[PDB]
Write a protein that binds this DNA or RNA. Structure first.
Ligand SMILES: [Ca+2]
Ligand SMILES: [Ca+2]
Ligand SMILES: [Ca+2]
Ligand SMILES: [Ca+2]
Ligand SMILES: [Ca+2]
Ligand SMILES: [Ca+2]
Ligand SMILES: [Ca+2]
Ligand SMILES: [Ca+2]
Ligand SMILES: [Ca+2]
Ligand SMILES: [Ca+2]
Lengths: 1664, 253
RNA sequence: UGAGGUAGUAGGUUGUAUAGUAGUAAUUACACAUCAUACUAUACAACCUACUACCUCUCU
């Protein structure tokens, strides 16, 4: 965006170098070396890794390491490296105590690293219980200063030198910089050779210094002598004034100003009066605070007199060029060194300049000069300059200005990082640490007085035409003459108005520095080809017809010889890695002679995660640049062959990758869906934002179902049995409970086709909890033509007059196509059983729509009260509600009341009154009982109870007042008069079952739609049964040492780097225990144009090439092979070498690299390691998870569980899909991942994620279930039987709803002819009675929920086969051709579809183990690269039976010694899916019955890379995670340091970094235990329950939450986390959260994620 | 009077027999709210009246259907809380201010106050009271939601402008001669320019065995000019000489 | 369990926002920037539902 520049990308000629540390330990692995590193932490990393590798070599026939260490044996505090060795390896390490004397019984051979002090090992080897032939490594902690050198000299000169080299171990000597040893240099070349003679090594100094020396663009060195600085009048006056004040302040008396004097005199003598005033700026700003900040009055006088001296200088300069009179103005008054810096910036006109200094005022005044001149001159418009100072304040005192300083460093180094400023005028902090862009100029201001300042800041200029310009000026000579007053020239001014010695000594200094780096490159082994070899190969790079994927087209891709190496580097830098991995191409040069010329073959090696597991043995050329280029050309041809590089020859990437199996590519659908997909402005498919309307599919047992006369139809009884009487707390009226199983008159289904078995569900009535079933009448019932008419009239009566269910628009259609079953009133028999009540049917026919007769007084006088006419009756009154009556039950016939018993109110007298007054009626029998009545039911949804809600919680009942109070107060009763009521022909008991009917019919249709799904999939893929034992019932479910230890651990971990930063000092010297080269380099510097002076401005035919490049092939053979072709195909080089190899004996090559660099550590197979000569060939029960029922013969799921899956949560029903839907979501993602691991055996898992994410998305699962039309089987609505239900045998026009004896043509003829025969607008689509809207995501939810249903009954295989039915092909196909009759019908095996075949779905194979046999003894190297993981296997309890899974899971992408497997990344991808599923399935089965949110948050707390890394460290990982990364070793070091503080428990805050690779290896061990166990989930869960079950149980009873979520919801609209800002270091970042009006709290970490997490932990423990 | 129109229609029917019946025509679950549409009917014997109505709530739709029949027979809100999250605030707290004692016709008043303003709202229920109060409070919040050395040079220029003729006399006299009295002339400049001079000769002796003096300008800055001599008086004279040098190099323009 | 109104309380759906957990990268040196890839939370809100408490008109 803003940065967007080249940043060198990657290297094109040298293979993009590996980082130096693993190269050093490569060389150390086979040579006695002396590693010259100033950083103790780097030396400690190499020592740690090297003791680890040679320890693996050691414990095979019995050896030991030693770590002779001078800083041991004084305190019993364990040393620097005892921490790292005892908490990051599995070895047992024994730093000895001060005056250690063998604690008890202490056999030394049971110790692996054995930290000692040098005289301690002299003791212990003269003790002769630690034999030298048993020692396998001797790490001289220091051998680069004279004291420990004299102390370790008795060891070598007594034991190591009188020992044959078949017994002398590796003598890794942790020296410091040989490039900082400070002995002039005239004896330097002696002493290290002396050292090499006496510690018996040879220095293999390959540092960050040297890795810029070999494998970088060497910048152009321009050591400019500037000029002598002469003085004008004004500068002479200024020198007079400051010399006067200096000589006075020598004599001023107090029985820090010399800092200002000794700084400002140097500024005057190196920059001039202008920079003297702009440093009077800095020092007077120091005095303006430090004259007030002192308490001593005479020190106050002293600082303020120096302040007035700076005022005097500033006024002198201000009165000199603004007042005596501006690029000629600054150039007049600047010293010439400033002028040469101006020419160096002017010439280099794009820039990334990195000027260096060593004092903070110097950098500030350089900033001010560049700011002024850049705002003046035309040339340097592009210089926008930003400076730096060092750390002058302290975190103890004045933290406000110290923090403002730290924010200024942060805000300067962020805007140098992209491109906002090109110029960074720094100081000594910028040498190491701080990361900068690639630089094309470093103008060093002072001479670099140390070698290390020279090299670490010249080695920052890497933008390929980079420059290194050192300015040279005469050094400071004091012109002070004494304590005199102002001079004659000073007074006249105020009243009127040796280059050669310095240049020669810097030439000798830089000749010394050149000899230092020449000795450094002398000591380095991997020598690199000179520039003329590159020029020769560049000339030679056209005699080869480049490899072409599409050779017919001259636009298509091409691999020449330069692009060969650039393409190998581009391929390996696109291979996948984490933050701490360096993925590079390894390379082994060689030489041998071939009938004349000597030829330089290569061998190649790509990263371990690459699919290319072979050694690309390159082809020889006369010059090693040319055969390097050809070896990478052979690599790129083989890359394109094997299919990494595709037909355009740039590596493939995730997006362009395509699924290989053709079923996985289809993703096709009904064309309105892709219309909406291409629209991109409606709610897109698969989401919950798009509502599609479907049809409430009446079951296929209810369509075409009505009996006609004579047709034998089945009679089902709607049996109701009360299982749970109402609690009397809810009984706010005290009515008797009425069981319905002893009621006389109930109902029956009557149907031509059988409803199959269903779940005996339960309803929740006014009288309690009832169980609704269905039972058949055995004698199939023959209807005559007459009884159909009475059942038609009865059914219109029962669902229109009694229950009032019939809507307006719908009709009764007695001869109707769909939803056409009969309901008949059943009477119990006296002996037993029921039948249809024919007498009651005749009564219903006779008593038609009889409006109740308003009885006149004759019958009221004539006939009396009857108890039997009102006991168990429905007693609707006739004096009011004449046409739409109101029906009451009868609770009791109350005898104590009467029409003369008192009126409960006071506006009337008793009950025989106010029937005359309100109505006009007269009670005749005034000696009759009365009627305690309660209303009949009018909310017919009896599917949910009303006294217990969804979570098992029982809702508040009706106290004790509103009970047995107003229960029995006569105001709050309905008491009716029996002569003022008509007994409805439907009795009360028949009214109980009749009012329960609508929800009975709804739940039977729902269980039938679910059984339709079951029979459907059992028809298609053998999965279930077609018909039949009863289904399971439908039920709903209801202090200070802590901080002391923490400070100790964090401080010593940082104190390794503090000891480095207190070691910019001098190293080795010899107390008795070149010049020609310097003169040559001096002549080179003065003569080769490197030294600018103080006045010069700064600045063949193809046959001949075929003869040269092929000198081992003569005039013959070549003449035939070339032919008339213009340029050879690469096959001709390959073929000619193949011929020569065929002719002769076995060649014996020469391994080169000056030895061991990039060899013996990586890719070596056939070597004599003594003399380094190759002989190569160019040519190759308690809740099981995996429990599966016997799926053949299985009936599939139950329709209650399928119904549960089909039931959305908008139903407000009992059952619900959601727990199945989360479990099926996780099982689907799991199973897709496992098949993608089986199938794409070489594909990088970021493309397996692409393929899985295509299979598992919401679009795919919606689209599949819509292909199966699952929207038309779902329950998505609150069932109100008066609003969205169609009673049996009625009909609805289905179109006449919206488009608005004549109503009975709509089914008969048409709809539009019926139409035209005669809040947010008004139009609404969609039909309530027979449709229901469903979101597309809800269809995907029902898809995952149905996988959940098939999962929980019929196993993992059944859920795989259900997603095979549904369309996700995630199994293999083995087709037979009518292989049977499909009577045996193994599940999976579909129809004999079209031509008579079956298409059986196969199981999952055991995949081939990832043991790469590209090396000849990979089983023995697997036995040897996993020595001692048995204690690790005991640390997790499962023995890997194919251990390359274990090594593969433990192998980081940087562990380049591994040649046998891949990295862990594919197993990490698989084991995440396995772990996610296992945790979700575990939290499903806890009897607390977690919600979706509970299970998700408890998984996110149980599965989390921080919890993963903490349980990794706690249960013993990280001592077996084999990496070779330095930074990851640092992070593991600090994190296990803290985790042993805590005893394995879970300014700016700085939490310790959580090592993400430890969480990844926690996952990858799950993936490897999965794959290694023939894909079982009860071998993964055994191990990981044994690890995380304390965490499961602890987070089960509470809620941990992530710190970020917990803060952000505990202050819910208040804890706001802000954008990250990068620090000064450039690998750290800081996050601040403002808990509003309570504080800003700050955290740091390498990345944004751990930075917000740390900031959240800061505010969390703050607000407590 | 204030009966709901569904109960008003029920009252007009219950005095004439006849109980109405409501049937739901169409519910529509759109992107942000569902609408409900009821149909109310009126007998099956003599002039069977009917109507339909709709609203975003079931009771609102039943009310609108009954109101139409009477006439025939005659959403976030928390954009406020998002805005509170924007301007770095804790969440608002509306509070139950007061209520009416009648149970079925109580009109709540609820006030919401934060650090800036206060608002309130009256509703037939307390939820719509919060909606009206939060609308008024959202309306209320959405209507009205070195240089030190140069300074020293500047006011020393001002004190120079307030000095007078002795600056130009100082410029046009060579200070090499001691025949002009340095201490006396510095005191004259003090009397001239509203300040005083200070002379400090500290009691000890140097390594050279000489005496020294510091002159302090009793003005706004701290101020020291140094001087030394073999005697105390010559040291004070040389300190006043350097003070004359200070004022001299300040003066020339 | 007439109808209405109000208060809690207990369920769920949907919207909007802030997120999280897992996965995943390629731009990018490498990261940030992710994420119509999966799951969910919180806050506010709309709605549906159940019960209780107080009422008013009924009804008795
Ligand atoms: Ca009921
Ligand atoms: Ca009712
Ligand atoms: Ca090999
Ligand atoms: Ca899913
Ligand atoms: Ca879902
Ligand atoms: Ca991972
Ligand atoms: Ca009510
Ligand atoms: Ca994505
Ligand atoms: Ca996302
Ligand atoms: Ca998503």
């Amino acid at each position: 965006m803003a940065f967007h520049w080249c940043d060198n990308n990657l290297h094109t000629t040298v293979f993009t170098p590996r980082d130096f540390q693993v190269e050093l330990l490569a060389t150390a692995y086979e040579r006695n070396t002396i590693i010259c590193l100033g950083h103790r932490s780097s030396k400690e990393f190499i020592a740690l890794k090297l003791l680890q590798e040679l320890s693996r070599r050691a414990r095979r026939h019995g050896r030991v390491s030693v770590y002779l260490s001078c800083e041991v044996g004084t305190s019993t505090e364990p040393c620097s490296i005892y921490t790292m060795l005892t908490h990051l390896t599995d070895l047992r390490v024994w730093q000895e105590q001060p005056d250690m004397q063998i604690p008890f019984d202490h056999c030394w051979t049971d110790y692996h690293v054995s930290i000692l002090r040098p005289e301690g090992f002299l003791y212990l080897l003269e003790t002769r219980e630690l034999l030298l032939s048993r020692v396998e490594l001797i790490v001289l902690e220091d051998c680069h200063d004279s004291a420990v050198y004299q102390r370790i000299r008795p060891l070598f000169e007594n034991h190591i030198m009188p020992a044959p080299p078949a017994d002398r171990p590796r003598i890794l000597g942790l020296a410091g910089p040989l490039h900082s040893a400070g002995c002039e240099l005239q004896q330097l070349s002696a002493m290290l050779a002396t050292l090499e003679q006496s510690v018996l090594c040879q220095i293999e100094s390959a540092s960050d210094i040297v890795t810029v020396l070999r494998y970088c663009s060497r910048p152009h060195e321009y050591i400019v002598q500037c000029a002598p600085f002469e003085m004008d009048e004004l500068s002479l006056v200024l020198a007079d004034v400051l010399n006067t004040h200096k000589s006075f302040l020598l004599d001023h008396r107090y029985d820090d100003p010399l800092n200002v004097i000794n700084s400002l005199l140097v500024v005057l003598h190196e920059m001039g009066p202008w920079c003297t005033q702009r440093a009077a700026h800095h020092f007077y700003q120091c005095n303006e605070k430090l004259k007030v900040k002192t308490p001593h009055e005479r020190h106050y006088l002293l600082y303020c007199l120096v302040s007035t001296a700076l005022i005097q200088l500033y006024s002198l300069c201000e009165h000199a060029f603004h007042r005596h009179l501006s690029r000629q103005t600054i150039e007049r008054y600047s010293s010439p060194k400033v002028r040469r810096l101006l020419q160096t910036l002017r010439c280099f006109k794009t820039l990334c300049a990195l000027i260096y200094c060593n004092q903070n005022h110097t950098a500030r005044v350089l900033f001010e000069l560049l700011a002024e001149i850049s705002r003046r001159d035309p040339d340097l418009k592009f210089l926008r300059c930003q400076y730096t100072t060092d750390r002058v304040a302290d975190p103890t005192t004045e933290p406000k200005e110290a923090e403002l300083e730290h924010r200024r460093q942060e805000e300067v180094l962020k805007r140098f990082r992209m491109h906002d400023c090109n110029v960074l005028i720094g100081t000594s902090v910028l040498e190491e640490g701080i990361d900068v862009p690639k630089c094309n100029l470093v103008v060093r201001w002072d001479p670099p007085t140390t070698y290390r300042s020279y090299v670490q800041c010249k080695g920052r200029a890497r933008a390929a035409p980079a420059y290194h310009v050192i300015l040279v000026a005469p050094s400071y000579k004091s012109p002070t003459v004494g304590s005199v007053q102002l001079t004659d020239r000073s007074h006249r001014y105020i009243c009127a108005t040796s280059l050669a010695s310095t240049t020669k000594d810097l030439v000798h200094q830089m000749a010394q520095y050149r000899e230092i780096e020449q000795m450094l490159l002398s000591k380095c082994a991997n020598t690199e080809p000179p520039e003329q070899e590159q020029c020769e190969a560049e000339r030679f790079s056209a005699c080869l017809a480049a490899y072409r994927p599409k050779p017919h087209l001259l636009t298509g891709a091409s691999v020449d010889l330069g692009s060969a190496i650039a393409l190998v580097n581009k391929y390996c830098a696109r291979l996948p890695s984490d933050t701490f991995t360096k993925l590079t191409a390894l390379w082994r040069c060689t030489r041998n002679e071939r009938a004349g010329v000597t030829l330089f073959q290569y061998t190649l090696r790509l990263p371990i995660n690459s699919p290319l597991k072979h050694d690309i043995v390159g082809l020889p050329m006369p010059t090693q640049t040319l055969a390097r280029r050809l070896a990478a050309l052979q690599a790129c041809v083989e890359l394109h062959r094997i299919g990494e590089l595709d037909d355009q020859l740039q590596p493939i990437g995730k997006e362009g990758f395509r699924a290989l199996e053709p079923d996985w590519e289809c993703f096709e659908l009904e064309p309105e869906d892709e219309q909406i997909v291409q629209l991109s402005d409606e709610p897109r498919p698969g989401t919950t934002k798009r509502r599609q309307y479907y049809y409430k599919r009446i079951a296929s047992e209810f369509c075409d179902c009505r009996p006609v006369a004579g047709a034998p139809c089945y009679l089902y009884f709607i049996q109701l049995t009360l299982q749970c009487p109402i609690p009397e707390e809810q009984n706010t009226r005290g009515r008797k409970i009425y069981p319905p199983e002893d009621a006389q008159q109930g109902f029956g289904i009557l149907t031509t086709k059988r409803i199959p078995k269903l779940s005996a569900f339960s309803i929740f009535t006014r009288s309690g909890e009832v169980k609704v079933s269905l039972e058949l009448a055995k004698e199939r019932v023959i209807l005559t033509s007459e009884q159909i008419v009475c059942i038609n009239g009865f059914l219109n009566y029962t669902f229109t007059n009694v229950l009032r269910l019939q809507k307006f628009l719908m009709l009764f259609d007695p001869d109707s196509t769909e939803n056409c079953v009969f309901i008949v009133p059943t009477v119990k028999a006296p002996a037993g059983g029921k039948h249809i009540d024919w007498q009651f049917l005749e009564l219903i026919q006779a008593n038609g729509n009889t409006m109740p007769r308003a009885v006149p007084d004759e019958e009221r006088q004539a006939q009396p009260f009857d108890p039997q006419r009102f006991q168990d009756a429905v007693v609707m009154p006739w004096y009011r509600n004449q046409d739409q009556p109101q029906y009451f039950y009868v609770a009791e016939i109350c005898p104590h009341l009467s029409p003369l018993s008192c009126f409960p109110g006071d506006n009337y007298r008793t009950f025989k009154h106010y029937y005359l007054v309100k109505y006009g009626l007269t009670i005749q029998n005034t000696s009759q009982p009365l009627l305690d009545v309660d209303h009949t039911s009018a909310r017919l949804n009896f599917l949910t109870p009303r006294y217990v809600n969804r979570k098992g919680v029982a809702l508040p009942t009706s106290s004790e007042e509103t009970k047995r109070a107003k229960r029995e107060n006569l105001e709050q009763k309905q008491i009716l008069v029996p002569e003022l009521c008509t007994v409805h022909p439907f009795p009360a008991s028949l009214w109980r079952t009749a009012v329960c009917l609508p929800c009975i019919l709804y739940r039977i249709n729902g269980l039938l739609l679910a059984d339709d799904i079951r029979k459907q999939v059992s028809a298609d893929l053998g999965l279930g049964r077609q018909q039949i034992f009863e289904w399971p019932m439908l039920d709903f479910g209801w202090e200070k040492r802590q901080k002391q230890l923490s400070i100790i651990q964090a401080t010593n971990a940082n104190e390794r780097q503090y000891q480095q930063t207190k070691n910019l000092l001098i190293g080795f010297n010899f107390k008795h225990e070149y010049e020609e080269s310097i003169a040559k380099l001096k002549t080179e510097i003065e003569s080769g144009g490197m030294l600018v002076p103080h006045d010069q401005q700064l600045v063949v035919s193809m046959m001949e090439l075929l003869k040269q490049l092929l000198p081992y092939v003569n005039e013959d053979v070549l003449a035939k092979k070339l032919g008339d072709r213009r340029e050879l195909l690469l096959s001709d080089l390959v073929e000619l070498n193949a011929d020569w190899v065929a002719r002769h004996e076995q060649e014996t090559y020469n391994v080169m690299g000056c030895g061991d660099s990039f060899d013996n550590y990586n890719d070596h197979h056939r070597l004599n390691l003594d003399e380094k000569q190759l002989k190569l060939q160019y040519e190759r029960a308690g809740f099981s998870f995996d429990r599966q029922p016997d799926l053949v013969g299985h009936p599939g799921p139950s329709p209650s569980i399928i119904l549960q899956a089909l039931t959305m949560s908008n139903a407000n029903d009992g059952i619900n899909l959601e727990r199945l839907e989360t479990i099926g979501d996780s099982f689907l993602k799991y199973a897709i991942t496992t098949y993608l691991y089986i199938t794409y055996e070489n594909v990088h898992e970021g493309k397996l994620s692409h393929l899985r994410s295509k299979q598992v998305a919401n679009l795919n699962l919606y689209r599949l279930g819509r292909r199966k039309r699952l929207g038309e089987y779902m329950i998505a609505t609150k069932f109100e039987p008066h609003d969205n239900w169609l009673p049996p045998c009625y009909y609805v026009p289905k179109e006449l709803e919206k488009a608005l004896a004549d109503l009975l043509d709509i089914k008969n003829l048409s709809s539009v002819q019926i139409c035209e025969m005669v809040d947010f607008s008004c139009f609404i689509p969609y039909n309530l009675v027979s449709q229901h809207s469903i979101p597309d995501k809800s269809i995907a939810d029902c898809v995952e929920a149905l996988i959940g249903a098939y999962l929980i009954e019929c196993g993992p295989r059944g859920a795989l086969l259900f997603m095979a039915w549904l369309g996700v092909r995630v199994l293999p196909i083995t087709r037979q051709l009518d292989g049977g009759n499909q009577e045996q019908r193994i599940p999976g095996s579909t129809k004999p579809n079209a031509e008579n075949v079956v298409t059986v779905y196969g199981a999952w194979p055991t995949p081939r183990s990832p043991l790469l046999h590209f090396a000849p003894n990979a089983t023995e190297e697997l036995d040897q690269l996993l020595s001692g993981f048995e204690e690790f296997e005991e640390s997790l309890g499962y023995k890997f039976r194919d251990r390359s899974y274990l090594l593969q899971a433990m192998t980081h992408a940087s562990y380049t010694p591994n040649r046998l497997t891949d990295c862990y990344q594919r197993l990490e991808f698989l084991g995440d899916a396995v772990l996610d599923y296992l945790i979700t399935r575990h939290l499903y089965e806890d009897p607390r019955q977690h919600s979706p949110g509970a299970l998700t948050d408890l998984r996110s707390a149980l599965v989390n890379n921080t919890i993963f890394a903490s349980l990794a460290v706690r249960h013993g990982f990280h001592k077996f995670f084999r990496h070779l990364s330095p930074g990851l070793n640092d992070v593991i070091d600090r994190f296990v340091r803290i985790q042993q503080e805590n005893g394995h428990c879970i300014d700016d805050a700085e939490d310790v970094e959580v090592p993400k690779a430890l969480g990844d290896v926690f996952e990858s061990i799950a993936g490897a235990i999965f794959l290694d166990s023939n894909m079982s989930l009860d071998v993964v869960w055994h191990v990981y329950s044994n690890m995380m079950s304390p965490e499961i149980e602890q987070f089960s009873n509470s809620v941990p939450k992530s710190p970020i979520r917990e803060l952000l919801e505990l202050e819910p609209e208040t804890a706001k986390f802000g954008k990250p800002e990068k620090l000064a270091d450039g690998r750290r970042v800081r996050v601040t959260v403002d808990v509003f009006c309570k504080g800003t709290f700050r955290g740091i970490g390498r990345n944004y994620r751990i930075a917000k997490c740390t900031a959240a932990k800061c505010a969390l423990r703050q607000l407590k | 009077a204030m009966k709901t129109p569904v109960s008003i229609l029920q009252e007009l029917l219950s005095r004439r027999g006849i109980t109405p019946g409501y049937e739901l025509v169409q519910i529509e679950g759109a992107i942000h709210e569902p609408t409900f549409r009821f149909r109310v009917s009126f007998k099956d014997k003599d002039t069977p009246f009917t109507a339909m109505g709709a609203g975003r709530s079931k009771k609102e739709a039943k009310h609108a259907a009954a109101r139409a029949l009477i006439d025939k027979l005659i959403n976030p809100i928390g954009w406020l809380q998002e805005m509170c999250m924007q301007r770095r605030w804790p969440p608002p707290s509306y509070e139950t201010e007061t209520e009416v004692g009648l149970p079925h016709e109580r009109l709540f008043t609820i006030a919401c106050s934060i650090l800036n303003y206060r608002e309130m709202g009256k509703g037939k229920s307390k939820k719509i009271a919060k909606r009206l109060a939060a609308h008024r409070m959202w309306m209320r919040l959405q209507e009205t939601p070195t240089q030190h050395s140069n300074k020293v040079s500047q006011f020393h220029k001002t004190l120079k402008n307030a000095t007078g003729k002795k600056l130009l006399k100082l410029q046009k006299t060579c200070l090499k001669n001691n025949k002009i009295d340095y201490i006396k002339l510095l005191g004259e400049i003090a009397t001239e320019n509203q300040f005083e001079v200070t002379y400090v000769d500290i009691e000890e002796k140097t390594f050279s065995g000489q005496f020294q003096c510091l002159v302090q300008l009793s003005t706004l800055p701290v101020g020291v000019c140094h001087g030394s001599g073999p005697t105390a008086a010559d040291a004070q004279r040389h300190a006043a000489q350097n003070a004359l040098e200070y004022l001299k190099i300040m003066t020339k323009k």
